[PDB]
Amino acid sequence: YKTKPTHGIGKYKHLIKANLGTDYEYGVLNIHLTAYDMTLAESYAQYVHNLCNSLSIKVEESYAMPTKTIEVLQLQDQGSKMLLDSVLTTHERVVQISGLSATFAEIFLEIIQSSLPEGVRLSVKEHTEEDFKGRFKARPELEELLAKLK
Amino acid sequence: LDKARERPQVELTFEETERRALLLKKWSLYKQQERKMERDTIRAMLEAQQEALEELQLESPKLHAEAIKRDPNLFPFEKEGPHYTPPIPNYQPPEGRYNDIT
Amino acid sequence: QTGCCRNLAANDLSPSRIARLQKILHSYVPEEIRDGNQVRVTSWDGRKWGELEGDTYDRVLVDV
Amino acid sequence: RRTPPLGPMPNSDIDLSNLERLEKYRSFDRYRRRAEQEAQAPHWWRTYREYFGEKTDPKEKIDIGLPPPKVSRTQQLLERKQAIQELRANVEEERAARLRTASVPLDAVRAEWERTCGPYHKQRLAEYYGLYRDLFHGATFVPRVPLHVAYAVGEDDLMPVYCGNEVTPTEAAQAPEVTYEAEEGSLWTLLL
Amino acid sequence: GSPWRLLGALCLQRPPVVSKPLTPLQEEMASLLQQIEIERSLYSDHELRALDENQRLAKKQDILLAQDLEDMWEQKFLQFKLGARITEADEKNDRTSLNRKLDRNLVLLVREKFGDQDVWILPQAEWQPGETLRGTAERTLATLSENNMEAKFLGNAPCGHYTFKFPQAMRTESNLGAKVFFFKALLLTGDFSQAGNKGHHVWVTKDELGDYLKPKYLAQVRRFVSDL
Amino acid sequence: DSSRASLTRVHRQAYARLYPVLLVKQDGSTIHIRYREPRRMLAMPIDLDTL
Amino acid sequence: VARKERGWRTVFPSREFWHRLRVIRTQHHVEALVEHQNGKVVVSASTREWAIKKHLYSTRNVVACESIGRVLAQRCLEAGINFMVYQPTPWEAASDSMKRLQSAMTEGGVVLREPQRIYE
RNA sequence: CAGAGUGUAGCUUAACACAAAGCACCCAACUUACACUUAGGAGAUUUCAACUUAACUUGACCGCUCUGACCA
Numbered sequence: 004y005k006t007k008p009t010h011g012i013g014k015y016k017h018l019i020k021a022n023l024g025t026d027y028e029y030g031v032l033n034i035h036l037t038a039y040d041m042t043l044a045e046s047y048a049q050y051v052h053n054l055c056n057s058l059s060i061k062v063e064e065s066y067a068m069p070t071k072t073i074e075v076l077q078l079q080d081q082g083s084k085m086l087l088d089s090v091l092t093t094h095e096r097v098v099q100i101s102g103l104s105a106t107f108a109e110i111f112l113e114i115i116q117s118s119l120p121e122g123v124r125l126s127v128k129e130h131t132e133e134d135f136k137g138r139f140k141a142r143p144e145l146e147e148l149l150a151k152l153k
Numbered sequence: 154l155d156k157a158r159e160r161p162q163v164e165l166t167f168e169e170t171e172r173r174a175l176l177l178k179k180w181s182l183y184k185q186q187e188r189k190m191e192r193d194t195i196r197a198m199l200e201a202q203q204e205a206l207e208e209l210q211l212e213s214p215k216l217h218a219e220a221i222k223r224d225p226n227l228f229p230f231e232k233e234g235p236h237y238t239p240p241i242p243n244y245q246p247p248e249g250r251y252n253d254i255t
Numbered sequence: 256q257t258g259c260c261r262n263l264a265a266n267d268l269s270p271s272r273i274a275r276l277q278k279i280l281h282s283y284v285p286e287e288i289r290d291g292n293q294v295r296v297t298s299w300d301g302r303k304w305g306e307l308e309g310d311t312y313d314r315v316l317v318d319v
Numbered sequence: 320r321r322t323p324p325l326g327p328m329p330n331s332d333i334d335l336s337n338l339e340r341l342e343k344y345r346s347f348d349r350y351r352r353r354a355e356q357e358a359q360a361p362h363w364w365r366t367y368r369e370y371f372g373e374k375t376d377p378k379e380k381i382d383i384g385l386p387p388p389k390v391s392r393t394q395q396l397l398e399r400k401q402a403i404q405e406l407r408a409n410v411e412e413e414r415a416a417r418l419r420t421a422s423v424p425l426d427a428v429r430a431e432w433e434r435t436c437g438p439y440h441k442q443r444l445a446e447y448y449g450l451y452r453d454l455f456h457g458a459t460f461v462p463r464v465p466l467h468v469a470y471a472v473g474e475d476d477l478m479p480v481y482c483g484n485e486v487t488p489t490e491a492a493q494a495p496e497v498t499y500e501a502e503e504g505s506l507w508t509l510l511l
Numbered sequence: 512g513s514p515w516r517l518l519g520a521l522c523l524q525r526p527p528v529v530s531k532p533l534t535p536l537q538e539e540m541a542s543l544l545q546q547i548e549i550e551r552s553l554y555s556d557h558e559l560r561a562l563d564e565n566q567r568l569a570k571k572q573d574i575l576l577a578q579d580l581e582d583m584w585e586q587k588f589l590q591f592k593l594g595a596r597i598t599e600a601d602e603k604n605d606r607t608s609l610n611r612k613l614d615r616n617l618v619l620l621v622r623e624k625f626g627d628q629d630v631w632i633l634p635q636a637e638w639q640p641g642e643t644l645r646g647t648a649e650r651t652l653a654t655l656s657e658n659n660m661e662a663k664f665l666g667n668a669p670c671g672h673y674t675f676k677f678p679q680a681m682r683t684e685s686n687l688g689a690k691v692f693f694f695k696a697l698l699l700t701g702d703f704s705q706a707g708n709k710g711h712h713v714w715v716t717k718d719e720l721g722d723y724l725k726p727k728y729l730a731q732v733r734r735f736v737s738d739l
Numbered sequence: 740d741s742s743r744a745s746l747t748r749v750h751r752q753a754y755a756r757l758y759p760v761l762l763v764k765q766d767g768s769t770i771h772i773r774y775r776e777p778r779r780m781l782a783m784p785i786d787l788d789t790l
Numbered sequence: 791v792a793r794k795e796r797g798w799r800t801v802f803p804s805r806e807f808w809h810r811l812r813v814i815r816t817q818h819h820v821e822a823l824v825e826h827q828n829g830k831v832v833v834s835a836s837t838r839e840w841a842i843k844k845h846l847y848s849t850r851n852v853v854a855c856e857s858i859g860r861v862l863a864q865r866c867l868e869a870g871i872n873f874m875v876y877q878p879t880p881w882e883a884a885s886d887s888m889k890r891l892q893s894a895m896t897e898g899g900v901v902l903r904e905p906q907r908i909y910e
Numbered sequence: 911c912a913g914a915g916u917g918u919a920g921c922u923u924a925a926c927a928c929a930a931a932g933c934a935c936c937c938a939a940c941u942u943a944c945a946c947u948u949a950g951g952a953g954a955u956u957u958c959a960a961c962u963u964a965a966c967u968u969g970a971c972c973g974c975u976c977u978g979a980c981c982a
Contacts, residue, residue, distance in 0.1 A: 008324040009364045018330060020338060026222050038234075039762065040772045042747050045942070050744035052943055057935095058195070059340065065943040072254035077247060077784050085250045089774070089781055096942080102340075105223040106206070109666035109695065110198045112230060114191070116697075117616075117739045120745035121235045121530040122762070122770035128229035137311035139262040141292060148307055149299065158553040158755075173543060174417060180540050181937035181951045187743065188936065192920090194737045198670070201734040205672040205692060209644070212515060212690060216644050220668040227665065232697075234770070235530045235741055238594030239613055241767030249784020346946055347879070371795075373828060387927080389963070396930070399840060406847055416847040417950090419890075423845040423857045425864055432841035436928035440834065444869055447830050481868035530741045537746055544748040548757070555755040557776055581777055588779035593761075593769060625982045632982090676981050689982085727981075739740040750942095816932065818953095838929060851950075881947050 021147065022101060024131055029103045031063070031131035034115075036096040037124040047123050048096040051115060058111070061102045068095035264312070265296045266304065273298045326363040380451070384460030438462045444482050470495040514687035517638035519647025522670060522695040522735070523662060525714065528613040529596055606713040609702055617714040618736060619698075620723050621655075626680075631713075631723035633732070635691055644669065648694035656711060660701035670695045670735040673728060693735060749773075791908050795827055803877040807904055811876045813891065819849050822858045822891070824866060824874055833869050835862035855887035856894050863898020873904045 004010060024030025034051060038044040048065060055062050071093040076085040103111065112127075119125050140148075210217040267273045277296060280289060288294065301317075333341075344350045406412055415421035432440075438461045445451060451459045469477040470490045478490045497509060533541060554562070561577035600611035609617065622631045634651040638644060645667045652662060669692035676688040703712065713723070717738045721729050749757065757773035763782035764770075774781065795805040803810075809832060812823040821836035835842070835858050837849035842861060846854050866872070874895075882888050892902060 006320050006322055008322045010321065010324075012329060012364070014330075017335060018333060018338075024223070029223060029228070032228070038772075042749055042773065043745065045750065046744045046747040049943060056944070057192075061339070062944070067942060069255070074252040074254065075781075075783065076250035076252060078249060088249075088784075089778075098943085105666060106202060106221060106668040107199070108224075108227065109668070109670065110195060110202070112665050113198075113695070113737070114195065114739075116232045116526060117737065118740060118743035119232065119234045120741045120743070121237060122772055123234040125232040125234070126229070127231075129225075135310060137308070139264070139292065139295070139311065140308060142295065142297065145297070145307060149303060152303070152306075158559060160552075160554055160558075162550065171414070176539055176543060177938070178951060179536060183534075183536050183937090185936040185952060187740070189920095191739065191743075192935090194739060197734045198737070201671045201731070202668060205669045208672050208674075208690060209669065209692065212513065212517070219643050220645065222667060224664075224667050230663070232526075235527050235613075236764075236768035236770055237529065237761065238596065238767070238769045239528055239598070239610070240764075241594060244767040246765045246785040247782065248787055250788070251786050348947090371828075373830075390927090392927090392930085392963075392965090399844070402844060406844075412847045416851055416853050419852050419856075421847070421853050423842065423860070425860060428841050428845060428861055429864070431844070432839065432928095435841055436839055439928050440865075443831065444833060447826065447832055483870040484868060485870060527741065530745070533742060533746070537742065541746045544746060545759075548748045552749070552754050552756045555775055558756065584776070584778045588761075591763070591780055591782075594767065628982080630982065674981095678981055681982085725982090739743075817934090819931080838931080840929080843929095848950085879947095885948060887949090 022131060027105055029105070029108065029129070030101060031129065032100050032103060032127055033130045034098040034100065035068075035124075035126035035128070036098070037126065038094060038122050039091055040122060041092075041094045043120055043123050044094045044096045047118075047120060048098050050118065051098050054114070055098070055100055058107075060100055060111075063099040063101050065096075065098050068097060070094055260314075261293060263294045264304075264308075265294065266299055266301060268298065268300055270298045324363075329357075376457075380457050380459050382460060383455070383458050385463040387461070388463075433465050437465060441482055448483055464499055464501070467498040468495050512685075514683075514685060516686065516689035517644070517647075518635045518689055518691045519638050519644055519651065520633045520635035520691045520693045521648040521651040522633055522693050522732075523619040523652075523660075523698055524695060524736075525609055525617040525619075525698045527616060531614045532596075606715055607703075607708040607711075609698075609714060611714070612716060615716050616738070617716060618720060618732075619712060619714055620720075621712045622710065622723075630725070632728065633693065643667070644692055645694055648692075648696075655703070657704035657706050658701070659704070661699045662696035663699055664694065664696045669693055671731055673731040675727070693732070695735065794907055807875040809871055809874040809904070811874045811895070811902070813855075813878075813882075813888065815850075815855070815887075817850070820854050820858055822862050824862065824869075824871060832871055833862065833865045835865060852887045852890060856890040859891035859894025860898060863895045863900050866895075866898065866900045872899065873901050875904055876902045 022030045034048075036044050036047050036051075038047075052062055052065055073091050073093060074087060075089045075091060077088040079086045116125060206217065206221065209220065265276060267276065273296060280294065280296075284294075301319075344353075412421065441462050442459060445462075446459070451457055467479070469479040470486070471493065472478050472490050477496070478486060480486060480495070499507075501507060557577060557580075564573060564576050596613065598610045598613065600608040605611060611617075619634070620631045621634050622629050624630075634655065636647050636651045636654060638647045642650075645664065649662075649664065652658060652660065671693035673691050673693075674688065676682065677686070715723065717733060717736050720732065720736070724732060755775060757775065758777045759771055760774040760778055761769045761780040762772050763780060765783060765785050769780070792808065794807060798805045805827060808827055810825055810827070812825060814821045814823065819837045821834065821838070823831055824833050825831040837843055837846060837854050837858065842857060843849060846857060848854060866874070876892065878888055895902060
């Protein structure tokens with residue numbers, strides 16, 4: 004009861020959660036992992052995802068990019084017609100992180116590049132300006148947002 | 154989806170199963186030390202970095218605020234993985250053509 | 256029926272019309288597709304969708 | 320009208336500032352273990368234990384049993400660690416443990432259990448039946464010397480009595496067999 | 512002012528060019544991963560090719576067979592020669608060339624003369640007013656003798672600090688000591704010229720870094736230098 | 740260390756066999772990747788268009 | 791004929807029992823508790839005691855869980871406890887170690903279901 | 911270099927004795943990945959003594975930290 008000293012003991016929503024990058028922290032980073040081997044690209048992203056959690060770094064999203072198929076054509080022996088030799092598939096994995104301090108950036112960048120396996124490309128770009136963060140919303144999430152406007 | 158690509162599953166001998174089983178238990182301890190070294194490596198970098206900043210603040214408070222700011226020129230950062238063999242100083246690749254399929 | 260939509264947001268202001276939509280989907284579309292968040296049926300003003308969800312959807316069908 | 324609480328709030332220690340950078344439970348089992356711990360703690364508000372828990376006196380129940388035996392922890396621990404290493408040295412035990420085919424001998428475990436922590440478990444088990452509550456009005460004692468009582472049923476079968484086991488009066492028509500480990504020259508007193 | 516001099520040090524490191532050789536335990540696990548992979552994978556297009564030909568040949572228009580095609584690939588591999596993972600510089604123990612120890616990270620050391628004595632330290636430059644502390648570390652590259660290299664600086668905060676005092680000879684109220692701040696960077700491309708190599712600079716790992724650094728100076732450098 | 744997460748396997752329920760192969764680049768460098776055929780080495784040729 | 795503490799339909803676990811088999815498995819040790827509805831513990835069997843630890847290669851494997859049940863089931867008969875309830879989570883029920891612990895109790899003479907209370 | 915201080919594997923005011931505990935960590939399966947769960951793995955009292963229980967107390971020994979000396 005409100006008048007009782009034990010009022011508010013059952014309150015729980017204040018313990019439940021309902022981007023801009025400052026001059027001290029990086030806002031949004033997209034870690035692109037390009038490699039022709041699908042197992043190596045998936046594994047390194049898995050290691051980075053585990054590494055970020057261990058260092059108390061929030062991972063916004065872990066997804067993959069569409070595969071880019073590149074045919075390799077080589078000149079025929081004593082001729083002028085290009086013949087098919089091999090087909091290479093380009094696989095890319097993206098790990099998005101947010102909440103990285105400027106000072107800790109040097110340590111984080113050194114750890115990932117040291118652990119980068121052979122044949123895997125590391126590419127981190129500031130894509131906070133791109134935005135386009137269109138994600139499908141659930142009903143309980145959407146209901147609360149409308150109540151704010153109402 | 155065709156089942157004609159399926160291969161016969163040859164039965165595994167007890168020695169092979171024993172060898173695999175004992176190999177996985179030793180591999181779990183091997184990976185535990187790599188994380189332990191990596192965990193201490195990060196702490197060693199982090200502890201020295203924080204302590205160096207403390208000394209800089211007393212020496213010069215204005216230089217302390219300049220180092221702790223972000224570096225927009227740092228990103229984007231590109232880095233390639235190592236190779237298996239060093240590049241050949243004198244190598245002429247054969248001629249060819251690339252076609253991309255999307 | 257196309258099967259090209261992983262997530263759907265079906266909103267009609269009138270709940271009575273919405274109730275008819277649920278029965279039609281239930282009778283025709285098997286429950287497995289509607290089991291998840293793939294089909295989201297809500298009853299709110301369409302004017303809200305211009306602010307609540309900006310740039311979320313690639314294909315929007317508007318039958319005012 | 321609001322009254323200030325008589326004590327600390329259950330979730331007052333949690334800081335709401337950096338709510339996003341706080342480790343969550345992420346599982347049902349983790350919350351349940353934390354929930355049980357706080358359910359066993361006293362609170363200034365009305366609780367289930369207040370009305371249904373068995374009331375106990377603030378005075379600690381006195382002990383009228385024999386003094387505990389003197390055991391050197393350092394020497395006792397040294398032998399146990401060596402025995403474990405020898406047990407783990409054998410590859411057959413690991414294979415039996417990995418193939419889930421190993422098992423323990425119940426008789427050997429109980430013989431060691433009866434000497435190490437058997438008296439303590441029996442004392443707790445005796446309290447459940449309210450023997451200390453009735454016989455000694457709450458006073459407790461550790462049964463340091465195990466007692467072996469068994470009734471002779473027929474000419475080859477025996478019905479042991481450990482702690483509260485079901486015994487029919489037909490099996491208890493005659494005096495049972497009473498045995499226990501004791502030193503020479505000591506005097507004892509049996510009671511039923 | 513203050514009686515402690517500000518010197519902007521630089522920690523140039525060369526990332527490994529080749530992958531580190533696998534340990535004996537890793538070799539067993541890596542071969543195990545391949546063996547598990549085969550037993551849980553279906554027939555490939557080439558493995559089905561061999562089966563079809565064998566059945567047809569057993570009963571009896573494919574010119575090139577599955578087994579014959581594999582032989583051609585093997586012969587071509589033998590004609591191609593792989594690059595040397597162990598370079599001549601490792602054999603010669605020439606710690607001035609970047610070609611040595613491609614598997615491990617390398618740390619640049621330069622020998623400078625202080626008090627009529629040569630001491631190996633990281634490149635450093637005294638801080639100047641109207642300049643960031645990191646900018647002084649970037650100026651160290653320009654002061655290098657005949658260097659054409661591009662370095663990627665990571666962050667702005669210093670990676671370490673080392674403190675020392677004059678041995679009661681140059682100790683003064685105006686000049687009592689100094690504090691060097693270590694800035695780490697990655698060697699993208701380039702190397703020094705051929706004018707002076709041996710007496711100018713060396714490239715050593717963390718394990719062999721103690722030969723040149725002082726016991727007090729070595730302790731502060733091993734903290735921000737990893738050996739993964 | 741590049742071997743932090745390099746030793747892995749195909750995490751697929753259904754897939755074709757893959758072999759460890761060498762990919763020679765335009766500078767002579769080589770890397771280990773997986774190819775459908777047991778070709779021990781592959782060399783990427785220099786494109787004529789990019790001149 | 792003793793009344794069971796019925797209710798608690800909105801919380802887990804339930805309270806409609808006399809004795810409850812509660813299994814606590816930690817990172818290193820596995821403990822099985824048989825306790826009355828009032829909270830008092832009847833009998834216990836854990837891998838922490840030297841009696842069982844000296845016969846177990848690992849105290850955290852399936853063998854340890856099955857071994858605890860075999861030792862506990864023997865002690866339950868000695869204590870006179872023949873019926874008790876087991877209230878696991880859906881994932882614990884599907885676990886292989888808990889299935890063998892249940893088998894050990896049943897093979898030990900203990901029934902994992904309590905008889906219904908007589909009201910009339 | 912002494913000067914004080916300090917001491918259970920990462921953490922803990924876990925350790926009455928029945929016992930060196932709990933948590934965190936590591937591998938694999940499941941997951942795009944994380945997480946959950948299941949199935950597994952690695953562990954610690956600085957060392958010796960003191961009438962003995964002594965991880966606990968007293969010094970000794972020993973391992974770290976800290977202020978000056980030493981210092982380019």
